[PDB]
């Protein structure tokens, strides 16, 4: 319901992290997508806390090692997903009220995400 909001707020959060890691390691970031519902929004209420629907971390070859996508506004089954290229690792962030934002059921933290990132970055290291 309003789950939505905290999720969005979480999505920003996560994104923020993605940038941080990006700068931290100096690794390449690229915003991928923006909301359809921003484009074709044109007088109908927009209030999303960012404009960004999809964004990714790339190796420095334009090849991502990590993709990060939010669900759109009215697009049901609202979750945020991650997936590591060539790994078949598909992560489904739910939000759980009374907890926070959970990875399956385990609460996400930044470090979790960093660990995922480093193992990605270093392992797959396509370039």
């Amino acid at each position: 319901a309003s789950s939505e909001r905290e999720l969005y707020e979480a999505w920003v959060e996560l994104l923020s992290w993605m940038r941080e890691y990006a700068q931290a390691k100096g690794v390449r970031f690229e915003k991928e997508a923006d909301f359809p519902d921003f484009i074709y929004r044109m007088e109908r209420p927009y209030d999303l806390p960012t404009t960004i629907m999809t964004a990714s971390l790339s190796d420095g070859l334009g090849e991502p090692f990590l993709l990060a996508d939010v669900s759109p506004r009215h697009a049901k089954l609202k979750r945020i997903g991650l997936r590591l290229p060539r790994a078949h690792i598909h992560l489904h962030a739910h939000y759980e009220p009374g907890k926070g934002l959970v990875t399956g059921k385990i609460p996400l933290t930044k470090e979790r995400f960093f660990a995922l990132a480093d193992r990605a970055r270093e392992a797959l290291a396509f370039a």
Partner: peptide, 13 residues
């Protein structure tokens, strides 16, 4: 359909 789509790879030269 109404669920969120897949989001995958783009802007890859």
């Amino acid at each position: 359909f109404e669920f969120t789509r897949r989001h995958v790879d783009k802007h890859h030269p």
